[PDB]
Amino acid sequence: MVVLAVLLPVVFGALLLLGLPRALGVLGAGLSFLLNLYLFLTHPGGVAHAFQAPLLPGAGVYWAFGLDGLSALFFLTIALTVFLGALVARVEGRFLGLALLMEGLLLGLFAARDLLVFYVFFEAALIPALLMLYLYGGEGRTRALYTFVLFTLVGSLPMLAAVLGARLLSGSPTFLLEDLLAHPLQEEAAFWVFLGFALAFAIKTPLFPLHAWLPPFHQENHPSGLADALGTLYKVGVFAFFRFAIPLAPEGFAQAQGLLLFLAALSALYGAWVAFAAKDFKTLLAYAGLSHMGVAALGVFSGTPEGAMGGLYLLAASGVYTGGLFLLAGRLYERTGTLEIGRYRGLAQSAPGLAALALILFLAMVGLPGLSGFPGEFLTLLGAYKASPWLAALAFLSVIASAAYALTAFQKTFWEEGGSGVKDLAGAEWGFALLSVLALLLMGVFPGYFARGLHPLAEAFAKLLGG
């Protein structure tokens, strides 16, 4: 059931960490992918694979899991992305076990059916990040590590007071999301709880003033970008917003809606705009991820189930293709040795299908219709315009900068005058690009099949803001 798929990447990452060899990670990620796909199919509803086990009877803690429409496809997305990062990695530092551990942690994070288990995974996801950052790459590794870790922790620890207030002030007997949702929080008490939630979730969203931890994180990881891909998967902020933040304290969200929508708009614009000024791949991709998170948070905060479903779909797909771009930059490093955009121009003539892979990925990034980005982008646009037209319009002065930075990077990296000549593709990279394009096309052209579980949650939690 759910716990099996949640733990499989954890146990495989352990067996790669202490045990040998690297190859165990490829087959482990494949087994995870197949299990998460099987869980994604035949999904009846939320209780699909429900798990309930007691841990602290007195304190009220229970292992609580289940596959919602959201948990299923996010499991599938994570399994797929980490499998891709597992085959193509080329890190081979024997630490892909850390990548599988982080995968399993993010799985448990998403599948949490009770508040405290979610909080536990939210705090646990910090350790592998600092680990694969510190000992596996980067010159400013220590400083970026401290910055990112301290930001996450300064956000997270007061959220413990927030969750303690949310449980105690509501008289909810347990930490179960069912029970906690059964007992609402009052005015000027849901206010403070939501404020403590919004700090920890915005600094991890990321929004504009709280994003300063993102570029240093992405720069000094392993140059291959496996750690970077998993950190982009670590932008789970929006998710916690929609399921936990807003439904548990909409009274404060009433005053905070405009502020948060504005932050999402300006964050998206700022990221997609600065990404033009980026002189390296890590900076560009970090600012792009910031823009996408701004869009997703905008869609969720706008109410308007259109916007919410768009935000979540865009979140999953952006995680997928941003992780793909990170791994691609790492592979081009391993074959070349640099991530600068100006140098190494002739790539296109030497790289037959790596050019096409990078192009498909950047197209999915700028949100091209037919690929994964556009459904979420447009649904979020609709929902935001429903909520507040002004911030939606400003926020979508982003596709312009999206095309600008993506095309500039692609052109000056591949198109221009022939250089020395570069390796074409590796055998693992073949399956990588094939599966990447397959998933992108399937998620972009057929958004009907995916995200069907997202519609009920969207409309229910959007009507919840009403009477």
Binding site: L150, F151, P209, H211, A212, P215, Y270, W273, V274, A277
Partner: protein
């Protein structure tokens, strides 16, 4: 310009951390090692506590 401003915002976060360390060493300076200082600060804190209790 927005890139430079982002760098400057990160610099302000740095300044927050540096203010934290400076405050920390101002409070760690409280313990010099002169036992009279420790006794005075001890009795001072205890008297503050006894006043708070009302």
């Amino acid at each position: 310009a927005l890139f430079y401003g982002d760098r400057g915002l990160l610099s302000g976060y740095f300044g927050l951390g540096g203010a934290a360390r400076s405050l920390g060493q101002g409070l760690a300076r409280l313990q010099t090692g002169y036992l009279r200082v420790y006794a005075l600060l001890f009795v001072l804190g205890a008297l503050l506590l006894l006043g708070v209790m009302r």
